[PDB]
Amino acid sequence: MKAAAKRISDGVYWTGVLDWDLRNYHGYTLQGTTYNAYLVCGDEGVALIDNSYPGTFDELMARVEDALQQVGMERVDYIIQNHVEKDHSGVLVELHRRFPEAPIYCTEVAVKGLLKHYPSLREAEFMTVKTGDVLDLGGKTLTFLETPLLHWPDSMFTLLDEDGILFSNDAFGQHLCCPQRLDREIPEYILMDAARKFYANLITPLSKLVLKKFDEVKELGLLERIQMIAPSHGQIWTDPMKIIEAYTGWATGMVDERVTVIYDTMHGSTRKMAHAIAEGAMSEGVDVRVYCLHEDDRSEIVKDILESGAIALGAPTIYDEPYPSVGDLLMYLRGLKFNRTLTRKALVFGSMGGNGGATGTMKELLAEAGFDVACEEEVYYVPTGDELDACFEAGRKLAAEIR
Amino acid sequence: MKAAAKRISDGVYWTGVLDWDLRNYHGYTLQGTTYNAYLVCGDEGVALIDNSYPGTFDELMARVEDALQQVGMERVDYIIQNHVEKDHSGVLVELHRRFPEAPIYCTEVAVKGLLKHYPSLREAEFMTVKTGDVLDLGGKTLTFLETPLLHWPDSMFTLLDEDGILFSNDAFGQHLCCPQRLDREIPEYILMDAARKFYANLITPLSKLVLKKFDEVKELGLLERIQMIAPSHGQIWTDPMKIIEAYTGWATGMVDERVTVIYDTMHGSTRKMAHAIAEGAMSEGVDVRVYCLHEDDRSEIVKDILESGAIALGAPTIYDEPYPSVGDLLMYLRGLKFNRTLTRKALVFGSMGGNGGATGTMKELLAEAGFDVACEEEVYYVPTGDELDACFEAGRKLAAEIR
């Protein structure tokens, strides 16, 4: 197969897979992604860091072969698995068959997870690693750093300290599929919006552990030595402090003045309320976003929630419950635990035809999910002018609190 | 507009609207529907029972006009509103303009409902009716029967005594849009499946009240005189006992032997578990359906739950929660209160990568929604043959139970 590797540093090559076609997975929408794998070539040893999704072996191997031919070397001597997730371990079996002599370097928890995914690796050679362990490739050394982060219990960072490259698994990732391999070769808006979305959807509940990981990195004296961050998806950071600083802001609740308004409706009354609420919020000079659960994906909604000090959630009542689509977002938000960054304000609202129940339900669930539920607007059927004014004031007040 | 009314009985015409294009509304999918309005003409007066969605006046008016010509009458004398829902009252304002001298006949609760939707009607002449009130058309009497059923407070039935026709609002409706008007003119499978779907999604939580309403219809001695049921959507029942008996079955929890399996998945492990459970259930000779939340609507899923004594629900864990799509289904089920017809058995299942939590949550929420959660199959990553055998066995045991 003809597929080229990309030299990223001396004896270090990107040898990953471009997934142009993926649009939706893990609960998340995207316009394609990459599975970044890296070939590190020392004086005496060659290490491959991570691999790719099942069925992508030929492409990954073509790039590994090209890299090797570029440096004048021939085998992979070590296979490194910073995580067990199938889009980074999906061709491990094929890799093991191709390089039978290569030990697999990973954490002890990764061994379990890898063997449960791929039982035929019962026969393979593993080298479990712990924080501070080293693999010497001759003139280059890889140091391992466990990053269990509660819910990524197999994960680790690999540090190449002579190039100052951190291979960070999914941390600092973004779902982007570009011909350009580097952060600086694409528009900054695109780069940061994808990085933002990845944080909101994947790192939010881990925010405390991420901050703790940063302090440990700083304590081992590895941070003054980051020249580059090579994540498992998307662009390589040649400006690692840009993404570290953004992450620090996201983990600590640094937001601009923004209110995200989210609703569903059947007959339009909750929609009118949502517009009046957004109108009020706008009058206070804050940024406003409006999403409709009928149309909009949860992963885009939470990207904006990350950057918002306040939200408004509205749905009509359907047999004592909110419209069922809010059950999807509320469950997601209960997993994301935004209170770990900042306990954002929440206004709940909706139309109803008799006994209601949706707004108190949403209050219950928003509070459990770590929002500070500020108040409510509940309307019988179609709102009147006065009721719409009341909606405008609710949004104005909500915007005023987060200024 | 050219559009013909369909003669149904002597001096009784269907004058509704054909909505070919509707696909999704009220949380519900369909392949089109109708808004059935009915013109009833005595020797002296003419009543119009219900109307149609906003913007559909021309079609309704044209059919009304055609009907008045066929009977040789000049105007609608009485406007009957069985319910306020905009599907059925959306051209009331234009009807009031067309027939200024016509009172509006509805329940007292319906007056508030109609005023909140249509403030201009604050001028209109209202004639509130309660159970057992009569309207005489001259050789044709309409008898009114309130049908609040807790959550349809504005609703009523209108009975035409001499012909034995029950105008049953949304009760006994189906979302079908055919050129044929009567139940016996279309395939029985289609008719009953649509009726089933309509009951499952719109009536389930009202089941005990439905049975109380049936008792009252019998107690007023009106059920013996029912020759025909004319609902607000779909086909007219020339065989009214057919749908009455099916409703009684659906309300009392009458089911054939059936398990509905429902799941979502990211990497396919929960799917392997869902298929094993399906195979285990099939080994016991019971019917099985398998739905995937990524693809299938909540309204098709609950249709089959209605007909099932047991369900299985499965999903992977993401940050301590079930995959978010189950939050939508679970919240819907919470509205529907299936335990009001029958407490069905449930099996929760799922694959996880660490601490899990999805099966715990799903067990909790299903119990809230009134299912008897009898078994829990949780697997770490990809299931072994033995773990797949245990899912098969759990499927088998669930099936055995409901025999």
Ligand SMILES: Cc1cc2nc3c(=O)[nH]c(=O)nc-3n(C[C@H](O)[C@H](O)[C@H](O)COP(=O)(O)O)c2cc1C
């Ligand atoms: C399927 C169905 C069930 C409903 N159930 C309830 C209910 O249990 N309680 C209630 O107060 N309103 C109920 N409603 C009435 C709606 O909440 C009401 O029409 C509301 O004004 C809709 O707001 P929207 O314009 O944003 O869709 C129900 C409506 C439908 C279609």
Ligand SMILES: Cc1cc2nc3c(=O)[nH]c(=O)nc-3n(C[C@H](O)[C@H](O)[C@H](O)COP(=O)(O)O)c2cc1C
């Ligand atoms: C975004 C993400 C978050 C996850 N969080 C958890 C978690 O919190 N706890 C856990 O046990 N597994 C977690 N998992 C791992 C999956 O639950 C595990 O891979 C499982 O086997 C998926 O099953 P499936 O093949 O049906 O998709 C997570 C996976 C992803 C992609």
Ligand SMILES: [Cl-]
């Ligand atoms: Cl999805």
Ligand SMILES: [Cl-]
């Ligand atoms: Cl070789």
Ligand SMILES: [Cl-]
């Ligand atoms: Cl929907």
Ligand SMILES: [Fe+3]
């Ligand atoms: Fe994956």
Ligand SMILES: [Fe+3]
């Ligand atoms: Fe990844």
Ligand SMILES: [Fe+3]
């Ligand atoms: Fe209720």
Ligand SMILES: [Fe+3]
């Ligand atoms: Fe409606």
Ligand SMILES: [Fe+3]
């Ligand atoms: Fe209706």
Ligand SMILES: [Fe+3]
């Ligand atoms: Fe957790």
